[PDB]
Design an enzyme around this catalytic site. Structure first.
Site, PDB file in Angstrom:
ATOM      1  N   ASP A  25       0.887  -1.643  -0.520  1.00 15.82           N
ATOM      2  CA  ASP A  25      -0.176  -0.297  -0.182  1.00 15.82           C
ATOM      3  C   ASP A  25       0.657   0.852  -0.437  1.00 15.82           C
ATOM      4  O   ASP A  25       0.863   1.890   0.878  1.00 15.82           O
ATOM      5  CB  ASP A  25      -0.793  -0.496   1.259  1.00 15.82           C
ATOM      6  CG  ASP A  25      -1.972   1.265   0.999  1.00 15.82           C
ATOM      7  OD1 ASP A  25      -1.594   1.485   0.286  1.00 15.82           O
ATOM      8  OD2 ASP A  25      -3.177   0.824   1.690  1.00 15.82           O
ATOM      9  N   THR A  26       1.312   1.864  -1.590  1.00 12.27           N
ATOM     10  CA  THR A  26       1.576   3.102  -1.089  1.00 12.27           C
ATOM     11  C   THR A  26       1.233   4.694  -0.704  1.00 12.27           C
ATOM     12  O   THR A  26       2.342   5.403  -0.649  1.00 12.27           O
ATOM     13  CB  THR A  26       2.303   3.164  -2.879  1.00 12.27           C
ATOM     14  OG1 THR A  26       1.190   3.689  -3.646  1.00 12.27           O
ATOM     15  CG2 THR A  26       2.944   2.238  -3.420  1.00 12.27           C
ATOM     16  N   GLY A  27      -0.010   4.055  -0.169  1.00  8.36           N
ATOM     17  CA  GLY A  27      -0.860   5.627   0.279  1.00  8.36           C
ATOM     18  C   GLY A  27      -1.130   5.249   1.641  1.00  8.36           C
ATOM     19  O   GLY A  27      -1.781   6.002   3.200  1.00  8.36           O
TER      20      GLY A  27
HETATM   21  C1  LIG Z   1      -3.655   2.751   6.674  1.00  5.27           C
HETATM   22  C2  LIG Z   1      -2.551   3.847   7.119  1.00  5.27           C
HETATM   23  C3  LIG Z   1      -1.352   3.833   7.532  1.00  5.27           C
HETATM   24  C4  LIG Z   1      -3.318   4.114   8.752  1.00  5.27           C
HETATM   25  O1  LIG Z   1      -3.007   5.026   5.798  1.00  5.27           O
HETATM   26  C5  LIG Z   1      -4.188   5.063   5.605  1.00  5.27           C
HETATM   27  O2  LIG Z   1      -5.221   4.536   5.645  1.00  5.27           O
HETATM   28  N1  LIG Z   1      -3.665   5.867   4.443  1.00  5.27           N
HETATM   29  C6  LIG Z   1      -5.014   6.170   3.461  1.00  5.27           C
HETATM   30  C7  LIG Z   1      -5.152   7.577   2.963  1.00  5.27           C
HETATM   31  C8  LIG Z   1      -4.454   8.612   3.614  1.00  5.27           C
HETATM   32  C9  LIG Z   1      -3.621   9.184   3.909  1.00  5.27           C
HETATM   33  C10 LIG Z   1      -4.053  10.047   4.981  1.00  5.27           C
HETATM   34  C11 LIG Z   1      -4.954  10.468   6.334  1.00  5.27           C
HETATM   35  C12 LIG Z   1      -5.836   9.551   5.444  1.00  5.27           C
HETATM   36  C13 LIG Z   1      -6.010   8.845   4.791  1.00  5.27           C
HETATM   37  C14 LIG Z   1      -4.179   4.842   2.503  1.00  5.27           C
HETATM   38  O3  LIG Z   1      -5.915   4.858   1.026  1.00  5.27           O
HETATM   39  C15 LIG Z   1      -5.204   3.686   2.338  1.00  5.27           C
HETATM   40  N2  LIG Z   1      -5.117   2.531   1.412  1.00  5.27           N
HETATM   41  C16 LIG Z   1      -6.318   1.818   1.982  1.00  5.27           C
HETATM   42  C17 LIG Z   1      -6.016   0.516   3.666  1.00  5.27           C
HETATM   43  C18 LIG Z   1      -6.833   0.084   3.624  1.00  5.27           C
HETATM   44  C19 LIG Z   1      -6.470  -1.691   2.611  1.00  5.27           C
HETATM   45  C20 LIG Z   1      -7.786  -2.702   2.610  1.00  5.27           C
HETATM   46  C21 LIG Z   1      -8.411  -2.731   3.847  1.00  5.27           C
HETATM   47  C22 LIG Z   1      -8.421  -1.406   5.147  1.00  5.27           C
HETATM   48  C23 LIG Z   1      -7.920   0.023   4.870  1.00  5.27           C
HETATM   49  C24 LIG Z   1      -7.835   1.915   2.101  1.00  5.27           C
HETATM   50  O4  LIG Z   1      -8.358   2.649   3.336  1.00  5.27           O
HETATM   51  N3  LIG Z   1      -8.210   1.723   0.945  1.00  5.27           N
HETATM   52  C25 LIG Z   1      -9.756   1.872   0.338  1.00  5.27           C
HETATM   53  C26 LIG Z   1      -9.679   2.837   0.048  1.00  5.27           C
HETATM   54  C27 LIG Z   1     -11.764   3.103  -0.218  1.00  5.27           C
HETATM   55  C28 LIG Z   1     -12.023   2.898  -1.321  1.00  5.27           C
HETATM   56  O5  LIG Z   1     -10.723   2.448  -2.052  1.00  5.27           O
HETATM   57  O6  LIG Z   1     -13.270   2.848  -1.511  1.00  5.27           O
HETATM   58  C29 LIG Z   1     -10.609   1.223   0.094  1.00  5.27           C
HETATM   59  O7  LIG Z   1      -9.926   0.300  -0.612  1.00  5.27           O
HETATM   60  N4  LIG Z   1     -11.280   0.320   0.135  1.00  5.27           N
HETATM   61  C30 LIG Z   1     -12.632  -0.497  -0.641  1.00  5.27           C
HETATM   62  C31 LIG Z   1     -12.361  -1.781   0.235  1.00  5.27           C
HETATM   63  C32 LIG Z   1     -12.820  -1.955   1.292  1.00  5.27           C
HETATM   64  C33 LIG Z   1     -14.246  -2.583   2.092  1.00  5.27           C
HETATM   65  C34 LIG Z   1     -13.981  -2.330   3.853  1.00  5.27           C
HETATM   66  C35 LIG Z   1     -13.285  -2.267   4.315  1.00  5.27           C
HETATM   67  C36 LIG Z   1     -12.218  -1.060   4.105  1.00  5.27           C
HETATM   68  C37 LIG Z   1     -12.102  -1.407   2.749  1.00  5.27           C
HETATM   69  C38 LIG Z   1     -14.148  -0.272  -0.899  1.00  5.27           C
HETATM   70  N5  LIG Z   1     -14.549  -0.625  -1.651  1.00  5.27           N
HETATM   71  O8  LIG Z   1     -14.816   0.490   0.185  1.00  5.27           O
END
Ligand SMILES: CC(C)(C)OC(=O)N[C@@H](Cc1ccccc1)[C@H](O)CN[C@@H](Cc1ccccc1)C(=O)N[C@@H](CCC(=O)O)C(=O)N[C@@H](Cc1ccccc1)C(N)=O
Ligand SMILES: [Cl-]
Ligand SMILES: [Cl-]
Ligand SMILES: [Cl-]
Ligand code: NA
Lengths: 99, 99
Positions: A25-27
């Site tokens: 995860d690059t974010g």
């Molecule tokens: C992990 C730490 C160290 C806390 O950093 C971040 O979360 N940083 C986020 C950016 C950020 C920076 C600074 C401040 C605030 C936010 C990145 O997006 C992190 N990437 C992932 C981490 C992750 C991956 C997988 C599970 C949980 C968490 C993410 O949130 N991904 C979301 C982004 C939103 C999106 O894509 O819609 C995602 O893939 N969500 C999917 C998958 C999902 C489903 C259900 C629950 C959790 C995840 C979704 N469909 O909502």
């Protein structure tokens, strides 16, 4: 490897002999892991994600193996549905984004 | 480019007539931007990450320019603390992870 992004960049990692699955995860500034047994003492940390803030347990100097790359660093344990490997560790295996 | 990860991988994007800074995020399935006005039809969507769930507007067939690529995809708009470029657009510019 070169990993394309048509599907989630899930990779096998190894911690304390256990194989598990983690997302590259690059974010993510930090590596955040699901509940599991880690060896040493921990201190408290709060971190922010897309949904808001969470409390985590911070463990230091933790050895992880990632696709045959040994890596040592800070690992945060907290409420996540996915093990996430962040920049703190991706920089140690020499990971870059290319296009 | 070959982008290393010692710092947050931020990129300027061009969308709906505006210039934005955003995070190349391989851990995000979707592209999510901070509150902004965008043309076209939108429907609601629930997304998650660390810290739980948020409600966002889903806009389909949005044109985005990224480092000289004009790409098309869905863009979500919502109360994210940061603009993120997710895999749905990263695949379109040919972005890979390498180590
Ligand atoms: C992990 C730490 C160290 C806390 O950093 C971040 O979360 N940083 C986020 C950016 C950020 C920076 C600074 C401040 C605030 C936010 C990145 O997006 C992190 N990437 C992932 C981490 C992750 C991956 C997988 C599970 C949980 C968490 C993410 O949130 N991904 C979301 C982004 C939103 C999106 O894509 O819609 C995602 O893939 N969500 C999917 C998958 C999902 C489903 C259900 C629950 C959790 C995840 C979704 N469909 O909502
Ligand atoms: Cl570290
Ligand atoms: Cl899309
Ligand atoms: Cl491809
Ligand atoms: Na740098």
């Amino acid at each position: 490897p070169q990993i394309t992004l048509w599907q989630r960049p899930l990779v096998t990692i190894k911690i304390g002999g256990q194989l598990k699955e983690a997302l590259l995860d690059t974010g993510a500034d930090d590596t955040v892991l699901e509940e599991m047994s880690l060896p040493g003492r921990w201190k408290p940390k709060m971190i922010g994600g897309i949904g808001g803030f969470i409390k985590v347990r911070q463990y230091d100097q933790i050895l992880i193996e990632i696709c045959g790359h040994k890596v040592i660093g800070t690992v945060l344990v907290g409420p996540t549905p996915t093990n996430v490997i962040g920049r703190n560790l991706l920089t140690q295996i020499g990971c870059t984004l290319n296009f």
